[PDB]
Structure formats: C-alpha cells, structure tokens
Write an enzyme that holds these catalytic residues in place. Structure first.
Site, short mmCIF file in Angstrom:
data_model
loop_
_atom_site.label_atom_id
_atom_site.label_comp_id
_atom_site.label_asym_id
_atom_site.label_seq_id
_atom_site.Cartn_x
_atom_site.Cartn_y
_atom_site.Cartn_z
N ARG C 107 15.79 5.33 36.90
CA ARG C 107 14.72 6.06 36.22
C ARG C 107 13.40 5.88 36.95
O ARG C 107 13.18 4.88 37.65
CB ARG C 107 14.58 5.61 34.76
CG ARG C 107 15.76 6.00 33.87
CD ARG C 107 15.63 7.44 33.38
NE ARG C 107 16.81 7.87 32.64
CZ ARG C 107 16.89 9.00 31.94
NH1 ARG C 107 15.84 9.82 31.88
NH2 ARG C 107 18.00 9.31 31.30
N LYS C 254 33.58 7.66 31.35
CA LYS C 254 32.91 8.86 31.82
C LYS C 254 33.03 8.92 33.34
O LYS C 254 32.68 7.95 34.03
CB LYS C 254 31.44 8.86 31.38
CG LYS C 254 31.28 8.87 29.86
CD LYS C 254 29.84 8.66 29.43
CE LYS C 254 28.92 9.75 29.94
NZ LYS C 254 27.49 9.47 29.59
N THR C 312 28.93 18.64 28.51
CA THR C 312 27.60 18.87 29.09
C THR C 312 27.37 20.31 29.51
O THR C 312 28.08 20.85 30.37
CB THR C 312 27.35 17.93 30.28
OG1 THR C 312 27.57 16.58 29.87
CG2 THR C 312 25.91 18.09 30.77
K LIG Z 1 24.31 7.85 28.20
#
Ligand SMILES: [K+]
Ligand SMILES: O=P(O)(O)OC[C@H]1O[C@](O)(COP(=O)(O)O)[C@@H](O)[C@@H]1O
Ligand SMILES: O=P(O)(O)OC[C@H]1O[C@](O)(COP(=O)(O)O)[C@@H](O)[C@@H]1O
Ligand SMILES: O=P(O)(O)OC[C@H]1O[C@](O)(COP(=O)(O)O)[C@@H](O)[C@@H]1O
Ligand SMILES: O=P(O)(O)OC[C@H]1O[C@](O)(COP(=O)(O)O)[C@@H](O)[C@@H]1O
Ligand SMILES: O=C([O-])C(=O)[O-]
Ligand SMILES: [Mg+2]
Ligand SMILES: [Mg+2]
Lengths: 516, 452, 515, 476
Positions: C107, C254, C312
C-alpha cells in the site's frame, strides 16, 4: 482380469486392441443356456449332467412326439432338477419350454419306410403330388407332401427346398401335381421339412394341433412357449388367447423365421414377451447372407425394448458328431453374446448328437469369455440415452443401482422380487455384475433365465412374521449363495434392491453394504 | 434406401443395429479380398476360370504337401486361367499367387506336466500333425525345406508369402533374408498360430507386411473359447497400423460336403468383415471339397452384405483420432480424399499409383466407396488385393509423351472400368488422386470431378 | 418449452446451443451460491434483510480495511438480519460469514497528510518512490511512499509498477525509486501496489493476518478466504494458525498471481476450496489470459469435487447504474456454465448505489444459465474422470444423481451431519436441487459453498426411536420443498440416508413420492 | 506447450478446460475479425492508420447521427489511411466500410422519481403512435424507475411497431452507400425476412454485391430468426437494443443460439455492443469485459465489434489492441476436436464439388498441421466454404477483386490478400503466380517458412464456381 483394461478404453477400436487372452473372466456366466431335449439327453441321469454343465432351460420340440412322450420328458427334467434341491444354496432352477409345431410342411414316406432314402441326381425330374395314394409311397420319381394348397401358392419357376434347405427344386411345370427339376440333389429321406421362400403359405399360424399342445403345456405347468412362424401381431394374440386365463403367467416367445415376420417385427415384439431369432428356417426363407442383418437388428431392438431375445440354431452344429467345435462356431457364439443376446440355444447338439455335454460346456466357456470383452462403457451410455424418462420408482432405482455397481465394482446386485419385474428392469441396463434375484415364487425363479445376468435363487425358508426380518433373511441367503459360488467373499461391497413394503411394485430402496 | 444408408446416419451404435434392413440392397462393389487355397478340387484351368469369375482374388498354394513340379503346374494353370480374360482390359482382374510355407510342424521329427495334442486336436486328457500347447520352439523358424520352397517362390515370381508359425520378429527377418534382393518386393504375411505369436504380436506386426489370423492351429495352441479375443485384438491393431490382416480357416467348413453353409458359418464371415479384416480365406472348401465355386460365391455375397452394415461414422472418426500427425503429403491427401468421399457420397476414389502405397494409405481410412487403383506395374496390381477396398486395374496403354495427357489417359481408363462394372455412371462425382510429377512418392493432388 | 429441456436432449453441443430458447422459463430453484461483500452501502440491518430475501447466501468481510470493532458490528448486523427469519424453520435461510484476509498487500502512503486527498499524475512525468517514513503521510505528485521495504531488492530498471488496482502504471527509470508515469490519473491515499513478475518475499501470514484470524475464530466465522496463496505451505500455515479451535473453518485459497496458477495442483490439494480472484490476477498476469486461468481452475476444482468461487468485477458497472452491461450479463452466465459453485460481488454490494439490484441480477442470470447447462455431456464426463471407489457413500451419491436424471426428480434430499454426504452428491452436478437436512448450524452455513446444495437447519429435538428421527428430518425437507415450490404432492424425489447414526454411514437411496 | 496444443488433445471437454495453460503462447495469426465504429475519436487519417496497424478490419459508420457530407469525409479518410500502406502488396491489409442504418427509431436534463404527447418532467413528446412498460434512454428509465431524463431513445418491448422496414431516410442512406461503394450494410431492427428483401430491393442492381447483415434487436427477430438467417448474408447480435427488448438475463441465450445457427449454416455472425464498454474512459478493461470478448470467440463468433470504445472514447487504440490480444488467446483455446466433428455431422451431404474440396482441405490441414490453407477465389465463396468448417490454420484468400478482399473480413480465419499483378496468358502460370504470392505473404507475416507444408485450393478454369482441386504443397 475380466478384460477390465479394455473396458477403460476411450474408443471401441482401442477397446478391441486391448482384448487380452490372458485376462481371465469372472466366475459368473450371465448368458442363459437353452437346450433342446431328445434321445441323447432325456434320461434323468444325463439331465443331471446337463444341469451341472450349465443348462438353464430344457426345450421340448412339439414338431415330433406325442403328449405322453413329452410328459415323460418333463417328469425327468423335474426329477433331475429336484435331485439337487437337497442343498438350497447350490440349487439351480430349471425352466421348461414348449416349442410349437406351427404351419410346418412335411413330406411322406420313402417306400413305406421311416428310414429309407433315395438318391436325387441333379437336373433330373421329380413330380410332387397331393394325392394321398402316394402318402406312403414316395420315391425318386414322385414325392408327397401334406400342404394341400401348394399349387395355389407356387408359380412356375418357383424354388422348393426339402430337408433343411439341402435339396432344392425348381418348378418347371405346374399341374392340377407339380413337375419340378432338381437343382441340388442328394439323399432324400422320409418326413422331411419343406420351405417355400417367397410364397404366402396360408397355413394357420395356430393350427388345431397347436391348440391341443398349448393347452397341454398349460396343464403341464410349462414356464414359456416358443411359437413358431409368427408372421404378425394377431398370430401372437391367438397364442395369448388359447393360453387364456389359466396360462396368463406363461411367457410367450415369438420365433421369427420368415420374411413377413422380419418386416412386421415391431408389432410382433410389442405383443410378445420375448423373441427368438430362429436362424434355421430364417436362413432358408431369406438369403443366407442376410441372416446376420436380421439377427443384429432383432437383438438391438429387443435390447432397446428391454425384452428377452434368444439366438438359436446351428451354433455348434459340428459338435453333433465331433467333441470340439469349428472356429466359425466358436466365433458365432461369442458374437451373439457381444451382439446382446439374452440367451443362446442348442438344438441337435443336445437333442440327438453324440457329445451333448461338451456342447453345453462349450457354450458356457465361450459366453463367459464374450461377456468380459463387452464394451460396457458404450453399451450402458447408449441404453440410457435410448431409454425414455420414467415415473416408475423401480425404474429409477434400477438405473441408479446399475450406475452404482459400475462405480464400486460390486460383486453383484441383489434383488428381492416376487414377479421378477424388478430384476428384469435391472437386467435391461446390462450391468457387469451378476444379478442375484431372490424369490419365493418357483415360476418366477424359472422364468428369470430368459434375462441376461439374472441368477435366480429360490428361498425355501418360511415367511417371518416381522417383515423387516423377512427381508434380512432373503438378503443373507443371497450373500450365502454368492459366497458359495465365488461371486464375492466377505468384505466386498454389493448392491441390494428392496422395497418399502411387501408385495410387487414397491422396489424403491438401494443399499451399498459389505459382505458378511 | 440402399447400402444401409439409413443405419449409417444413426447417432448411436445400438440405433445403428436397430436400423439394419434386409431389404436395403448393397451396392455392386465388394471390398473384402477373397483368398482361395488351390488343390485337387480346383487346380484345373476350367475350374480356375469359374473361380475368378466368382470373385477369387488370391490363389493360395499350401506347401505343407506337394512337390515343386506339382505346385509349378498349379501356378501355371492359375496364370492360364487369369490371362484368358486379358483380351478385354476393361474387365480383366489381376489374380495374385501366395505361397504358404510348411514351417516347423511336428508329425506322427522330435527332440521333445502334460498337455500335448495330436491329429488337429483329436487327443490329449483323452480322445478318439502334433501340437504342444504352451511349449518351447525346438525347430527353426525357416528350416532347410522352407528355404528351398521360399527360393522356389522367388523363381515362380509369387506376390506374397504366408509364413507359418511366426513366433517373434527375428523369425520374420529370417524369412526376409531368404527372399533376398531378388524377392525384396514380395510381401511377407506373418501367420500367428500359437501363444508366443500372440504375446509378441506388436514386434511381429512391425516387422511384417501383414498378418494372418490362422485360427486352425491357434484354436489348438490356446483355448478354443479365446480365439475370438485374439482375432479381434489382431484385426484391431492391424487396422490401427494400416497393415493388411487375413482371417483364415474353417470359415465355411461344412461347405466341403454341403452346397450351403451353416448359420454359424454365415455369421463368422460377416463378423470377420465387420471386425475389419482386409481379406477372408478358404482352405479345404476350395482345395478338396465338393462345392468350391459355391463357397467362393457365398463369401462374395456375405462380404458385400456386411460391408454395407459397417458403422462408418464411428470407424472413420476413431481411425483418425488414433492416427498420428504426419508431414507426408500423401498421407494428408489420402485422409482428405476419404473425408471428401463421405461428404459427396462418391462413387469411387481413383488413385494413380506405381507401388500401390498411395492406394494403401487411402484404404487405411476405410472409405465406403471403392478405391480404383490404376497402375502399370503388374505386381502392384496383384498385391493390391491384400487391402480392403482396393480394386486394382492394370493399364496396358503405352505412355504418352505429355505427362498431363498420360495422367488423363489413366484417369479415363478408371472411369471406363467404373462404368462397365456398375460402380458409378455418367454425371456421378468421383475423387481422383494424382501427383504433381512422375515417380512414386509425390501423390499430393485430390480433385473432385464428374464422371464423363 | 421448460428448463431448456429441448436443448438438454441434443446429441451435440452445437445442436444444444442451437436449441437454447429465451421463451423456455427456468425452474424456481437457483443452484449457484451468491456471495456478497458487506460494506457501508449494505451493512445496515434493514438492507441486509432485503439482501437475504434477494438471494445472498454468504456475507464476505474484507479485512483489507476496517477495524475489529467495525467488523464485529457488521457481523452482529448480519446475524440480526439472519435470525429475524428464524421463527419459521421451513422458510429460514442459513447465511454464512466469510473472513477475507488482507494478506501480503503493498500500500502507498497518505496524500498531503489526508486519507481523502488526491493528486493528478500525468503521462511521461517523473514520480519518485521513497521508503523513508518521513513521507508516509506526505505523498504528492512528485514523491510517493509505500510500505514494502524490500522493493528495491526485487525490482530493476524497466520494471512495471501498478498502483490503485492497476489504474496507474509506472516504469522504473533509476534505482528510493525514480519512475516515469506510463498511464496517469487521480492518485489517492493508501492505494494498492502490484509488482508483476517480481519475487515479492512478504510472509504468507503476517502479524496483521494473525490478529484477524484469531478474531475470526472468536467471532465464529464459517470460512476464510486467504489472499495471495502462492504454494501449499501457505495453506498449511493458515491451517496451523487456526489450530484446534478453528479446525472446522473452511479455508478457501485465493489465486491472484503467477505462482499460484503455476502451483495450483498442490494448493488445491491442501485447501478446502478455491477463489478465482480475478482483480489482482488480471494485474499479475496479462489480462487477456485471465479467462484461461479461470476455466482451468474451475475445471480442476470440478474434477476434484472442491468448491470454486468466481470473483471480482462481475457486475462492476452496477456500482453506479441500476442495470448491468451486456459484457457483465455474459460474464456471470459463462462463469455458471464454466462450472463455478459460487459467484461473488465486491464493490457492487460493499459501496455501490444499487446493492439490492446487483444481488437480484446475479440470481436471475444464474438461474437462467443453470437451465442452459448441457447436463448430458457434463454428467458423462464427471463420471468418466472420477475413479472407482470402495466408499459406499460415493457409490450411493452417484446412483442418486443418476436416478434423479431418470425420473426428473424435484429434489435430492440428503441427511448429513458434517455436510460430506451432500458434498458428494453436489460433485456430480444434478439438475435437481439438493436439500441437505442437518441439525448442525455450521454445516448449514458451509453448504453454501457447493453448487446446488440448499441447506435447511432442523430445530426439532432428537427422537428416541432413530427411524422416527430419520423420518422426521425427511418430512421436514418435504415441507421445505413444497413451501418453496421445488415440488408438490405426487411428485417423485430421491432421499439419501444411512444405516446408523453418526457421520460416514450414508448408504441408502430411496425413490420416494412426495406426500 | 504451444497454442494450447496439450488441451487440444484432450478426450473430454472437462479435461480440455483442465489443460488450458497461461504459459502456452498463441500463434501470430488472429482469426476473428475486428469491427470498429468510427467517430470523433477515430475520424482522423493519422488515427485510422494506427487502428489499422492495431488490427481493425472493418470501419463501421453509424447513420443514426451525422450527415451524408460528414460520413463521406469519414469514408475518404478511411480510404486515405488504408491506401497509405498499398506501396507493399505483401503487407497491405484491406479495410472494409460498413453502413449501419438508423432504422425504425423512436426518440424523444430533468429528474424523475418513481404524460406522453405524440419537453419537461411533466409531459414528454415522442414520435410514434398507439401500441405495458416503456423504456427511455438505453432502457435506464422505465415507465416506475427514475433517472436524469434528457432526444433519448425509446423501446417498447414485446409490442409490434407500425414503423416500416425501411424509412425514407434509410432509403436515402442506402442509396448513399451504393454511391459511396460500401462493402456491407448493417440493417437495423430486422423483424422478418420481408424486411431483408425490402433492403435488398432498395440497393437494387448497382448494390447487388453488397452484403446484407441483419441486426437482431428485439423479440420478433429472435423468434423469426430462421427465416431472417436464410434471407440474409449474415447476422449481427445487437446486444444493446436486444438487452432492452428482452430480459437482460436472457441475452446470453439468444447470443449463443444465434451464433450456433449461423455456424451451422456457414454464415457470418457478429457479436456487438458493450464488449469493452469501460474502455471508453479507462485504458484497461474490466474482468467481465475481457471474459465477454473471449467467450464470444469460444461461442464461435466470426467478428467482434467496438462501438463507443472507438467512436467516442479516450482509448480507441487500446481497445482495438485488447480485442486483438483476447481473440488470439481464445482461438488457441477452442476445442477443435469436438467443434470440427460436430460441424461435419450437422452439415448436409451434397453434390457441390467445391464443398467436398473444402472439407477435404480442412481435414488434410488438421492431419499435417499446415501453416495455412491457400484459396484462390474471385467472389470469396470458395474461401467462405473452407471457413465454415473452422480450420485452426489461417485461410489466405488470394483474389484480384478488391471488394471480395474487403468482404472476406466477415468470416473467421480468412486472411484476405489482394493481388494486383496482370493476368498472365497461360492459365496455369496465372494460378502459380497467385499461389506464389500467397507463399510470400505467409512467409512475411510469419505464418510458415520454407519447407513447411501448406494446403492449396484451386479450380480447373477461370471464373467463379469451379474450385475442385486440393494440393498439399511444400513452401518454396
Ligand atoms: K482482502
Ligand atoms: O419385483 P416385484 O415383483 O415388483 O417384487 C418386489 C417386491 O419384493 C419385496 O422386496 C418383498 O415383497 P414380499 O415380501 O411380498 O415378497 C417388496 O418390497 C417389493 O415390492
Ligand atoms: O503410390 P506411389 O507408388 O507413390 O505412386 C504415386 C505416383 O504415381 C503418379 O500417378 C505418377 O506415376 P508415373 O511415374 O507412372 O507417371 C503420381 O501421381 C504419383 O506421384
Ligand atoms: O454426511 P455425514 O456427515 O456423513 O452424515 C450422514 C449421517 O447422518 C445419518 O443419516 C444420521 O444422522 P444422525 O447421527 O444425526 O442421526 C447417518 O445415517 C449418516 O451416516
Ligand atoms: O471462390 P470463387 O468465387 O468460386 O472463385 C474461385 C475461382 O478461382 C479460380 O481458382 C481462379 O479463377 P479466376 O481466373 O477467375 O481468378 C477458379 O478456378 C475458381 O473457380
Ligand atoms: O495354417 C493355417 O491356415 C491354420 O492353422 O489356421
Ligand atoms: Mg423353424
Ligand atoms: Mg440497436
């Protein structure tokens, strides 16, 4: 083992490439074996050995013999059959079948003798008469036959076959009488069968003589009727009618043996309980090179309808005189099983031949070999895609048990049945595993032989008052039969089909259980 | 309809069986080769003419018996009967000569648990040549008598050799060395007769030009109930490899004594064709029996019926899925021709070939339509009978100075042959396979043309 | 014209396509699970109730943002809405709760000391990337701070750097990090950074993930969606962290980067299920290759019988508009046709303007797509590719599915404690809904991961007579099906039970008329 | 490990999916056609040159807006851009021009929360007649829904509009396209076969060679699809309007049904509208959009189309390049083993030798892994008959007809090449010249190299309709 490596092939061609003569088959033999009983096999002593060699159905041919003779044959079969009833776990039911005479055409006596023969030389003249004055005085000049209206059906230039199509005559001149020339000749004996290919033989499908034999079979408690020369559905209706109310449970098997029966096969199969591809007369009524078409067509349509089909006649013909078959006869039996035939039959090989036991044993060895080589993956897929959707709970239960048996490689599908129908519905989907049908109805156990893979067992224990215990009793008997026959051992998995309540029509429960 | 075309358009094999129609007449062409053993019942010139007219393609001479002067006279009569039709080259049929070796057979020589059968499996263990079911191979693959017979075959210019009791690849190489350079174009057909040949089949097939399922000895060496398994196995692998396979022995045995076959015999011939056998063979039925012509006629009629009943939609798809990719232009052209012949219901595939290879590669994919192989090589024409569907025609015309004109001559010859034999007629569509230059190995051109 | 049954009976896939009919309505039952990300737009009790009624089966909590207090309140609101229907057990729908980990994210800092400020980046302009903490709250269009301290060790000149879910892209020009803006746009605070093709060495389970997973065990979540799984040992680390207390929590891995696709087989083997996380995946690999990886992973999960989630941007435009685009309508349908067990919504429900509409659109598309599935080919292929087994439950499961196709049953009723017996039926993809009756509330919530399992939670007490307890649970399922319109009296259904209580004994299949 | 060859050898569809590999790179040949709508973002000559280099094969002109003078300059700019590459015939790419009709339209910013007169939020004007729900502005507003209504389009689903097939404006536009020598017409709102005939009648004798692509955009066109397909040269799945006329959750059914039946008939099918919609404002597409383009190719669409993405958006070049990249990946993912088998099984057996030559050529190309199938064609027909069987290799269609080369873009896999050499006197030498020309084009663009094997389709005499010769030929 059991050609399982060829069973996993993605194409049929690769399936053939994987067929392995060193892949031994499983123990069970799914194809039923019908045996024609006669002088070489009708003794109680020989019949006991017919049963131990694999005979499931004893066939009686009413083209010959008297009611008293056949009644004695039936008694000996049942005597030999019940001789094993001392052991209810190894007892094999044996069915009795009556093969009607039908619209047969037969010649007269050669010089008043049943055994006399004359030599017909090719190209010579031969007169055919209906004047009964020559009924017992046939020779190489004049020949009597018992079809009075043979002149109304035979045009000039027609062909007539005598003695299983071995002698052939061409009608060169019609009379009141028939003037013919012999095309293919040889020894002409007494009381020989006649075929008229391409002629509307108006002889009744159900003669007055056939009426008596059918009612005789009803009185004798036969398990099924093989009806000869069925040409149309109304012919089947007469048979059903004559059998009437008392013969309601007698299975009717229509024999297809001429051109018309082939053309009308659908309406005939709809009315019948089963079919026999009777290739003997069929091979004479239509060209011999077309018989294999008719056979594959009839077996496939019967497999599609879920009705039994029998392959009959000249399957191991050479074994009438020799203790081993020819290569063509080995492949003929194997290909009939690969075609999808429920049962294979033997005629003179057991009725009059010199090696009746070897014939039964050879049919057993080949069928078990042919059953392992069946390409189940395609057959099961095609039977389901061709079978309609159903609302019958037993039907959905049957296809689910067959699918489950391929998935867990089960040793058997155990089915409790009263009328057989539940086991029939499993059989039509052709599982690899044997179908052990447990019943208390003796007639049910005997008629189950007409279906591929159904191994009927007759439970002799009394009905327990607690119904859930009566179910476990019969299921454990099946486990004992299967373990004793080597179908499976303890620890294996098997499919069990039962209903939710006693009585026919409620099979709806499938269980996967280990062998006790 | 005709030719079981209603059964051909079925979506499943089971429904394909249900549509088989005894009233659907087959076409004129018969694709399966017919191999006849010539013996005392059939070695006269007049008889052999009728056997050719009845459909004999290959004359087999069994060297288990007989002297060279005897066999050389049989070969001579065969060629006299064959060449008696040469006056009309439109209708002339090439006829091949095959030599069947005696091989290592034990008769009642010796240098020998239990299990030992005698007299064609008539004793053991009891009962009323000698075989040793599952035993060692004491005798050599090619004995000294076989060498002389094989050398005699090269001298008599035979087209192919049926080598008895082949057990391993080196047996095939041994036979090949004996034929030498003078007989290098002679086709070697390995006969599989025992358990060892079945176990080592893949190495035998790779070394061989073709296979014979010799069910006579095979049915004694292995259990009789297993012969159908090994037969379908070997036919399948031969189809996959594109090599010819012959089904042999006792196909119509009862016709030795009777003018019509049994029902088992009628279905045995048919199922062999349905299995995929390139040729079917008669032994005693033509060599010593009372009805040699009728047996040849019966194999012709059954084979033509069974060919119409083949489920081409599954066979053609599965033959391609199992065949490997290729850089050979002739192989790509061949499968494109077969696909095109199905698409336009072709009356024939016409193939110009010198060595036959171009036609063999077409036959590999099993078209329904006959393959008219036009050649000027007489040995190529006779050897074409080993392959399902190849109908050879021998062009006798002289070569044209313009190559394009010489190609058109041979194509037009095949057209006249096809019209005269009822394979097709004017206006029908046919596939024509040629090359871009003279010489073998250049087949790369497929044309879709109407019959003139 | 019903259930695309005319197209169902085709002999080729091409003919199946040719027979699809817009006038052939689907049945009532919708088999594909619907997962919704809960956020500001949807975390009120009022909106959650309508989302449940609109078809939501799973509430996804995304721990990339928010505090434990915030998520605890969301979870409380989810359970308040869910239990408001608990008075009628026949109509009550279980709702699962999923925790989605932050994982090894990268980030950026704060733009000009504000979490809401934003600058504009221009193409070709230079941008400096610093790791100095003096700028973590002093980012602007000239200098950008990010929290990955090893970034210089893993990038080189010419490397591509993507910022804010792939929107902005940079290229390193000198090694602090000097870059030239490739594609510009507004740059906000705390945006995510992707380094495609670089060997990022962040821990599989960070200290923040440790605290979030512990929070997940305390809050009784049903499943964890583990971000950025790279190898089987990442999955094992999550399993060990959850420990004994979290042993029943399902772990969904994921797949969002290149190594995850490369090591998919070992990751699948270790996991309870798979999420195709196409957002990051489309940045880590070329976006034109995402569809390949999605169909590969869905196929291999179907083959293994493990749940797979497609996620998504399925209906991204519904963040702002009340109706989807044609591409979005196609994407949801093709994911169901591919074989996905569940489809997921993210911003559409977490922050968009039309969260109820988006849930309803997924329900409508999925039900239409389920009728269009070429069941003849799919069922044949799943069986051929599945091994023979000695497990009675597996043989019973495949026989039940075969029976359900034979009689066109309205449902397959399954009694299960752990869910396993229903999962084994779902693996063979029947057309009929699978009604799984359980007394275990967690089994009921977790069954939403499997295509076609419609879980019902039985509240009735255990009967002393076990055959009566069984009959009681079967009749409860009969009532649920009639009340929801799966079937009506006189229809035929399949019932799966076992011969004795406890897990692992399912071996009895019955074809039963609906009373 | 190339072109998804491992997945191509799978024996089931499921295993084919399981074997798809993101590390298996595709070939250079892209088989699916790309149609771009030209507008203010793409109208300039220099932009059009880049769109051609990025993969645009067809320029679409939308005649719902603009004047004849406007569209005429657009056509001139396209042809200016196209011919700037003509200096090298080896690398020249033909570019087609398509006219898209306005058709039977019903058109009308204030607010609306949940009175029609035939311009405020109390009474709206529409140009129509009598006749339930009504949708305004791309179906966003429903009449009941809400929105910021502001000359927007109106849809009346299920209804039967009394508007004629062709309007007086469409007649003028069709006659304009004839004068401007366009290659194809996208006929809007085709409801029945008679509407296709009225269009064909308007184009008349001078426009008889102009391909008519019928746009299916409402419930009636879906139901009457078979009759419309037979009368048309091709079909466009116009998902924009269709998604308003029928429930949007059913659009995928109609699209898959229409692609299947077009593939079965061998006629071109275009998938259109909103395929990359977000690229109007963003340089990269969403995950749903990349999936949509790829699944359209896997469905069997011959062409894919861009509308506002190239006409009005900020990233037209990026949008064309993305359709190119996706289409190329998806073509390698096609399960050819099943597709080719099913296409043959459903195709009829005929006597046309050109058709039998075409299947044999496609079969041969699969057997020897050819780099291309070279087809000499003057009308295109022989190349179209190869493409209907969907070879994996590209079809190099060599023609001297410039309109044929441009119209070939409607067909999957057909790589049109325009030969401009003089016709040689010897027939055989004029065929060899055009074949060698395709060899050079193939080698230049990397389809094959010297020593490779290619399939070559020729005929037996000049003129169209005589293709009957298939050759397997080594590349020189
Ligand atoms: K997440
Ligand atoms: O096959 P059928 O004739 O329908 O009989 C099967 C029947 O057998 C049973 O298992 C036992 O029935 P019975 O006790 O009356 O013999 C029933 O549950 C079932 O309905
Ligand atoms: O099958 P083969 O032996 O390869 O022969 C095929 C060749 O025969 C040809 O017809 C030419 O033969 P010729 O040399 O006799 O003219 C060519 O078409 C082809 O190259
Ligand atoms: O799917 P699971 O976890 O194996 O549960 C199935 C079990 O449920 C049962 O139907 C009975 O459940 P109960 O133990 O709650 O009575 C068993 O027969 C069966 O083994
Ligand atoms: O595809 P089409 O329109 O039928 O044209 C194919 C034609 O091309 C050719 O190969 C060459 O013909 P042209 O001389 O007219 O170019 C012909 O043999 C064939 O008829
Ligand atoms: O040699 C043969 O032909 C045989 O044994 O079958
Ligand atoms: Mg008879
Ligand atoms: Mg529109």
């Amino acid at each position: 083992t059991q050609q399982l490596h060829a069973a996993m092939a993605d194409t049929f061609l690769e399936h053939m490439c994987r067929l392995d003569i060193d892949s031994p088959p499983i123990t069970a033999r799914n194809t039923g074996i019908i045996c024609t009983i006669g002088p070489a096999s009708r003794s109680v002593e020989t019949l006991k050995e017919m049963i131990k060699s694999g005979m499931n159905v004893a066939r009686l041919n009413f083209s010959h013999g008297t009611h008293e003779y056949h009644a004695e044959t039936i008694k000996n079969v049942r005597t030999a059959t019940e001789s094993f009833a001392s052991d209810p776990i190894l007892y094999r039911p044996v069915a009795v079948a009556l093969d009607t005479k039908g619209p047969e055409i037969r010649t007269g006596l050669i010089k008043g003798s049943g055994t006399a023969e004359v030599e017909l030389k090719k190209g010579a003249t031969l007169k055919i008469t209906l004047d009964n004055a020559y009924m017992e005085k046939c020779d190489e000049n004049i020949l009597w036959l018992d079809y009075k209206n043979i002149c109304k059906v035979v045009e000039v230039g027609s062909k007539i076959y005598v003695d299983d199509g071995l002698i052939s005559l061409q009608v060169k001149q019609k009379g009141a009488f028939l003037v013919t020339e012999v095309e293919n000749g040889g020894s002409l004996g007494s009381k020989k069968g006649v075929n008229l290919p391409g002629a509307a033989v108006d002889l009744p499908a159900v003669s007055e003589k056939d009426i008596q034999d059918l009612k005789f079979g009803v009185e004798q408690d036969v398990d099924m009727v093989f009806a000869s020369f069925i040409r149309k559905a109304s012919d089947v209706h007469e048979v059903r009618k004559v059998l009437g109310e008392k013969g309601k449970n007698i299975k009717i098997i229509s024999k297809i043996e001429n051109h018309e029966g082939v053309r009308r096969f659908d309406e005939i199969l709809e009315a019948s309980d089963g079919i026999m591809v009777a290739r003997g007369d069929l091979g004479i009524e239509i060209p011999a090179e077309k018989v294999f078409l008719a056979q594959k067509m009839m077996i496939g349509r019967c497999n599609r309808a879920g009705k039994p089909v029998i392959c009959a006649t000249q399957m191991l013909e050479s074994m009438i005189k020799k203790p081993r078959p020819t290569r063509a006869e080995g492949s003929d039996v194997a290909n009939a099983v690969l075609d999808g035939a429920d049962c294979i039959m033997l005629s003179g090989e057991t009725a009059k031949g010199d090696y009746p036991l070897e014939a039964v044993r050879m049919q057993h060895l080949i069928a078990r070999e042919a059953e392992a080589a069946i390409y189940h993956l395609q057959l099961f897929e095609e039977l389901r895609r061709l079978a309609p959707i159903t609302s019958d709970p037993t039907e959905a239960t049957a296809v689910g048990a067959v699918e489950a048996s391929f998935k867990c490689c089960s040793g058997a599908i155990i089915v409790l049945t009263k009328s057989g129908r539940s086991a029939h519905q499993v059989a039509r989907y052709r599982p690899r595993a044997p179908i052990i049908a447990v019943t208390r109805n003796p007639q049910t156990a005997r008629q189950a032989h007409l279906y591929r893979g159904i191994f009927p067992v007759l439970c002799k224990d009394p009905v327990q008052e607690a119904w859930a215990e009566d179910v476990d009793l019969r299921v454990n008997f099946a486990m004992n039969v299967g373990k004793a026959r080597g179908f499976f051992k303890k620890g294996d998995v098997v499919i069990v089909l039962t209903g939710w309540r006693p009585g026919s029509g409620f099979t709806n429960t499938m269980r996967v259980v280990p062998v006790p």
